[PDB]
Amino acid sequence: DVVTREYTINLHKRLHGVSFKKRAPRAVKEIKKFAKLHMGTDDVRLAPELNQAIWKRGVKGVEYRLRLRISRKRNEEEDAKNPLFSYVEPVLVASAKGLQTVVVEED
Amino acid sequence: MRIYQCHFCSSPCYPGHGIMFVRNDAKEFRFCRSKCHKAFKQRRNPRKLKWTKAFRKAAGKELAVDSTLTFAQRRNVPVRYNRELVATTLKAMARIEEIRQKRERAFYKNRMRGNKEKDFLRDKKLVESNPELLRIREVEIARKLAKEQ
Amino acid sequence: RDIEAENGGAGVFNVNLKDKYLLEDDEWKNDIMPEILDGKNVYDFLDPEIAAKLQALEEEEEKLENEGFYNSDDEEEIYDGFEASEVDDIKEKAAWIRN
Amino acid sequence: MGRYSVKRYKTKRRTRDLDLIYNDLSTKESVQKLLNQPLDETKPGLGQHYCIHCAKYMETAIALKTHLKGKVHKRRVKELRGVPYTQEVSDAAAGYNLNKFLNRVQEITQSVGPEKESNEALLKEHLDSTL
Amino acid sequence: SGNGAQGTKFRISLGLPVGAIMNCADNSGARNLYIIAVKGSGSRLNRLPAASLGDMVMATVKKGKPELRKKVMPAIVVRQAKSWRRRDGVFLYFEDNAGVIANPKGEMKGSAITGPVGKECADLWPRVASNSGVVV
RNA sequence: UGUACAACGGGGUAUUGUAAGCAGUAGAGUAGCCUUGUUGUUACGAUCUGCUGAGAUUAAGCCUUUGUUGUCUGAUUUGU
RNA sequence: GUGAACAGCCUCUAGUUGAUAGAAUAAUGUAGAUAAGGGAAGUCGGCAAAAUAGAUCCGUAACUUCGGGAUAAGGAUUGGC
């Protein structure tokens, strides 16, 4: 069921009390588990444009909130996973405050 | 019970809070909390610290001289306990404090009026000196109307 | 001493510090001073003639109420050559440019 | 709490404070006592060469010449310009004893002010004539 | 409590252990006192006998007149500089440690006391309170 | 299939100490194009003042929720 | 670049990104820290830690083989514009 939504994600309440050499690698696993709860599929592809958006202030300077776009897509034949997977990509905004989940229309 | 103020903070110190300090010259320095107390040891100046009340009465903020503020001084001559004083003081303190807030809010509007003048003169500089950005928004409205079409 | 001994000994008799002092009415000899209202404890407020001094304050309301001095309500904006339709647009264009 | 602030601001190592030092300059009798202390064995300059602004004894009369020409001593001159911040300033900020507060500010503007400045003028008149 | 101290003595924070030099608050001629033991103290393995406000300690003198040095004598502590608890809701502390010296009957040796005297010490000992110029 | 559960958002408590941005007739001083000044000004100029108790953070083991968007029959085993 | 310096910390050219990894954050450890009041009462013993530290000006004892001792000890100071 191809659905594209918007989200924020509160990383300050997820990276609370982590070693500094493991903050930015932990924030990658958190977004995969966050997409698994909402979109309900296991394998999540993070775009490399989002990988820049986590590691931009070093390993220990991960931002508090990010603003995500998560699309759930059809998968190709003879994949043993599923017909479904997610593709998380970032949307760039002035500040990530005061936003809420909005469905993005299709065209 | 005494609601005595912080020496540095001018916030009320209820019974059970804060530290007292006593100088060898024997006057008492009662403190709001630990933040005000550790800043006192370090020899600061609450005329300079922006968050305290001694700054705000001095720097032209929240009103300092008022007829309503002269009602709560101190009394060193005890008034012998008539009840009909006590029944009016419990009506007086609910009445002085209302006039306090209607004057303090009105003092705040003298200090913040005419911000909308400078708010609009700020907007004439952003809009008029960006002609190229204002072309971009015109096609953004036309693309908005056409998608509903 | 002897009033103490007939109801309990010396460590268990309880002296009422009241009932031994001079008021204009003995009916309220046992009542309780409130000592605190919301903020700013009572013993700094009471006086002789609090309400008579409060009459001078209530005159300063009506000396300040009729003068328009308490005028919080202000609903229009008047600039040169500008109206409510045009000043709303300029504050809407400059909001778009900041984002 | 910290490391540096504990070393200098314990209760053992407390300096005098800004409140009493304004009282010492304010009259002409306490100035002449501190400039002319009787000599004491338990004090660093043997009870001479004492600065009044900075509550601090100096070792030698040479060490007053180099102390007055410094940015440390020009704090405490600039620090003691105005009303010395008693308890009464903090009580007036909450709406409590204005007339006790405003009468003291009235006296520092009128009486205590120019008596202090005519004392600090004479210290520079004296500490330049002897040094 | 012991001799001289009228009434009982409540629990306050123990500021002065054994071997703590403290100032001398009377006009007897001693400058600092040096505690060797605290009377009314407990007995537990590896503790130190600790003094408080309004105690009587046996104390020697390190700096003062040569008539007063090298003899143990009782002393009453009047200032603490360790924060204790008055039972109305405030903690408080003084600037320095201080103590006056007295006979075991509790009667003062000097004639005056400089600086502020603690309130809990002045209740417990009447002869201190006669010579105290400043209370609290 | 609801006093549902969760993700964000909105209030309440707290934490530090006045955001960026412009603006000023503040600013020790020095030079200049000179309209040779009768604050001569635009420049440079630590900092100070105004918009500004503003801004930032707020549960990861805080409080609260008439809002937004979602999820709600997977697996195993047990009987006198 | 800071600096007295090839000290220490940071970057350009060039080079690596190799050393079993994931999840949790009990005790006891190993390595590194901060503590109110008192200040060697600890202990065979101040072991260990803390404190002092660069530079400029002032100042500097007994002792002696006159060269030293000496950075003796002890004080005043250090930013920005």
Cβ neighbours for D78, distance < 8 A, ≥ 6 positions apart: none
**Model resolution, angstroms:** 3.5
Tell me whether residue A101 is in a domain: no
Query: What's the per-residue H, E or C state across chain B?
Result: CCCCECCCCCCECCCCCCEEEECCCCCEEECCCHHHHHHHHCCCCCCCCCCCHHHHHHCCCCCCCCCHHHHCCCCCCCCCCCHHHHHHHHHHHHHHHHHHHHHHHHHHHHHCCCHHHHHHHHHHHHHHCCHHHHHHHHHHHHHHHHHHC
**Into how many domains does chain E fold?**
1
Map tokens 């069921």 to a residue.
A1
C98 CB neighbours in chain B (<8 A) are 126
Looking at the structure of chain A, the number of domains it has is 1
Q: Which domain holds residue E30?
A: 15-136
Q: Do D98 and B23 touch (CB under 8 A)?
A: no
Two tokens at B113?
């009026």
User: In the structure, how far is the CA atom of residue E43 from the C1' atom of nucleotide G42, in angstroms?
Assistant: 18
Distances from the Cα of A83 to the Cαs of A69, A71, A76, A94, E85, in angstroms? 20, 14, 7, 35, 71
Residue E2 maps to a domain: no
Q: Domain limits at A66?
A: 6-96
Task: Give the contacts of E85 (CB within 8 A, at least 6 positions apart).
Answer: E12, E13, E91
In a domain, E51, yes or no: yes
Return d(Cα B21, Cα E80) in angstroms, integer: 12
Q: Nearest CB to B5: which of D79, D94, D102?
A: D94
Q: How far is the CA of A100 from the C1' of G5 (A)?
A: 59
Which stretches within D55-97 are classed as H helix?
62-68, 73-79, 87-92
Distance of alpha carbon B86 from alpha carbon C36, whole angstroms: 12
The radius of gyration of chain B from alpha carbons, rounded to an integer in Å, stands at: 27
Question: Domain coordinates of chain B in residue numbers?
Answer: 2-65, 66-130
Nucleotide in closest CA–C1' contact with A34 = F7
Any domain includes E79: yes
Stated as kind and residue range, the H or E segment containing D57 is: strand D56-57
- Is residue A105 situated within a structural domain? no
Spatial contact of A16 and A79, defined as CB atoms under 8 Å apart:
no
C 17-76 → D contacts, CB under 8 A: 40, 44
State the number of CA atoms in the 13 A half-sphere of C26 facing the CB.
5
CATH of the domain at E44: 2.40.150.20
Residue B54 and residue D94: Cβ atoms within 8 Å?
A: no
**Of D46, A10, E119, D88, nearest in space to B26 by CA:** E119
State residue C91 phi and psi, 5-degree precision.
-80, -10
User: Which residue do the tokens 């520092």 mark?
Assistant: D108
3-state secondary structure C26-85: HHHCCCCCCCCCCCCCHHHCCCCCHHHHHHHHHHHHHHHHCCCCCCCCCCCCCECCECHH
